[PDB]
């Protein structure tokens, strides 16, 4: 372990620390923005939630098919943000498909796609990229939902999975069901509802799909940014500990080198 | 290189083996797989195959023709489908099969010092047949 | 700050030759290996186009 | 022996006629330390004769001048000198200068001297290579890391220096292109550290463009050598200075961004570079 | 003094009749440097008698052979010799070889030599420990860092070597198991840096499997020792070789991936590991 080697490792870890700290700052700014509009997105999503909040609707007993909408970003370095969502998707596809329901997964998030690209690639109908780079908005969810309809797949039952923001340090991989099917949307709960017709009920379920996609994205993006900030901070701390240890080693090695060359020169002098 | 201090038959497979292994080393040093089958996964699989081919036991020197045979088997892509942990078993089995049945092929390789097109065709037949019959 | 303190420079991560340096080396290759394939395919399409015309 | 035979067949040394153009002074490592410390002096004396007595231009090629310094280190202890730092003789710089100052282009004649200097343990801070830096007008440092990358020659683009690298001397365009190449390679070095953490698919488009152009330039630096035809297998190429400047200027501008990086590796001029890309597309 | 009384209690040293089976030669650190440089030769001579004249197999246990070299360095300065590297005697290799070469199994008898070698400053590039490596068939390198993690014994899995680790000697199964364990631990070491900075999160699920399995192996390498019962409070577990091979086979395969890694720490056979895992309810 030459002083050269110790120096090289120390310099590398110092650079890593600096980069991680700057990355933490940028993630902090992005998280500050994402939390800011998460509050406006929150009540808008609650509006979608109110549908089944008041008109309690459950899948009758079984659906021929199923849709799992796992939302996430394409950028990693966010701990288990993508990993948790992928795990939930895997648990559900294991939980489902036993009853015969053909689950299909739309991987909003190339990370989700890649995690399940090697096991559940067949279940993937369409995967949406460019997620997380830009703060999500309704129009993005509009594109996702519209293409989902453009696919034509009979997503009688739907499920959206996302890391709902709990705190600056904690996130919850919440799952919200999507009772998109007109039959399930028209249950006993809507017996007392007057003007609603089947056609506009299907339209309402579509708009609900689009807006619940919007709400889910904002929660995920804020969670992703917060996790990225925390992870980069932790990486910086680890780099700091490592460079402290390496600096101690470097000092010891430098002093040893000076001592060794002194001893060599003295030995050469005395031998003369 | 010792101003061409390597037999021609060995050179023919060794050049491509070296290039493939270099490319494999350059690309497969991450262990953080994300998704490029055509470009990376194809290359790194061949690299793993060639590394398993290079692995050798102790006190068992191989004659140059046998090395040419096994390196041929690996470098022509014939072993790309073979399991990465079964490559060694294939190496041993193929070595034995060649030495016993197709010993004339080894003799021709050694005598000529070069794998001609006809000898290459013979090797193609041998490797393909054994590979198909490798797993009963 | 004080000059005596060890100062890092650009490229130190790769110069070290550690895991992070190897990750950077492989990651650059994986990206541009794919990019070259796209570029080469585009060049092939260009050549076919000029052959047609 | 390889050099002697090569020059015989090349014609530089003619064993039959008297038109030989290169004299050979050899003291190999088989020779004792004393002999290895004066062979350089013998060779430079021959070169000096070809400079002063005959008013001609001479080319002195010395291999591993480092051996001149090292041989002194092998005998200083017996000569009775207290070891200097690391272990070299106390009379390192003085003896090296005494040798080097003789190898110069006087007003009588010119001696273009190319000296190979072994860098012990790839440590340029070592006293032997460090002292020789001051005695050389143009320095070309070969980096092992670049050779590991495969670029041959392994000249370190950001370490090699020449005194004539002056826009007044080499020309404004030449100087500008060279400095641009060096700067883009420095920026690539800076970007690599970011890459290691962020990921290549996380950098900005400007960062990706810079990385791509820098890699293309690094590949185009590699040039197949005729003496290396035996090693690489590719035919040797010689690039005129105008073509070198034009090609690197075009790559800096971005005119060849569409071409793959592989096309720029082990080529001659950029005309060979673009032509190679077409071959790969035909074989795609 | 402890060992002498311990052997007396065990009966290895009988103070009544000549049934004793162990002879003791002691050159402890209180002795002057000259004495410490020759006591090892005394123990070697008394072992040599049993090896050759009596023709009986002997076990020569020597403690800190390093001290033999260290004593030589102390007297070398006063013997008028130009100091070698570090400051050791210029005759380190020769005197060490002269001593070690005598401690060898011959055709008359066999001497199984267990020599403890202290590494200065936990540094194995020091001339004394470095030279000793060439004179040993089997080498066990204890590491302080492994002890810091708690794994006892602190044997370094990837540094300790042996000459009978040959598939034609130790057996194919044993060889394969050992090599696989070393491989997975080496891969974990290769991923250490990425872990230490980024986090285990930024790893492949396959990589996480290697990390999870490797840690279980590292824990299972630890074993309660009979002489360490009075220290740890856990009874020692003398594990037969077959059980070790089978357990490491099972761990490598993935049969005990569900078990927590802590259950593998300071246990005997893998059965105790699974029992502890269940106990950890």
Swiss-Prot record, chain C:
Residues 1-25 are annotated as: N-terminal inhibitory region. It is found in: Mitochondrion. Residues 1-21 are annotated as: Disordered. Signal peptide: none annotated. Homodimer; represents the active form and is present at a pH value below 6.5. Homotetramer; represents the inactive form and is present at a pH value above 7.0. Forms an alpha-helical dimer with monomers associated via an antiparallel alpha-helical coiled coil composed of residues 74-106, leaving each N-terminal inhibitory region (residues 26-52) accessible for interaction with an F1 catalytic domain. The inhibitory N-terminal region (residues 26-52) binds the alpha(ADP-bound)-beta(ADP-bound) (ATP5F1A-ATP5F1B) interface of F1-ATPase, and also contact the central gamma subunit (ATP5F1C). Belongs to the ATPase inhibitor family. Endogenous F(1)F(o)-ATPase inhibitor limiting ATP depletion when the mitochondrial membrane potential falls below a threshold and the F(1)F(o)-ATP synthase starts hydrolyzing ATP to pump protons out of the mitochondrial matrix. Required to avoid the consumption of cellular ATP when the F(1)F(o)-ATP synthase enzyme acts as an ATP hydrolase. Indirectly acts as a regulator of heme synthesis in erythroid tissues: regulates heme synthesis by modulating the mitochondrial pH and redox potential, allowing FECH to efficiently catalyze the incorporation of iron into protoporphyrin IX to produce heme. This is ATPase inhibitor, mitochondrial. It comes from Sus scrofa (Pig). The chain holds residues 28 to 80 of 108 of the full protein.
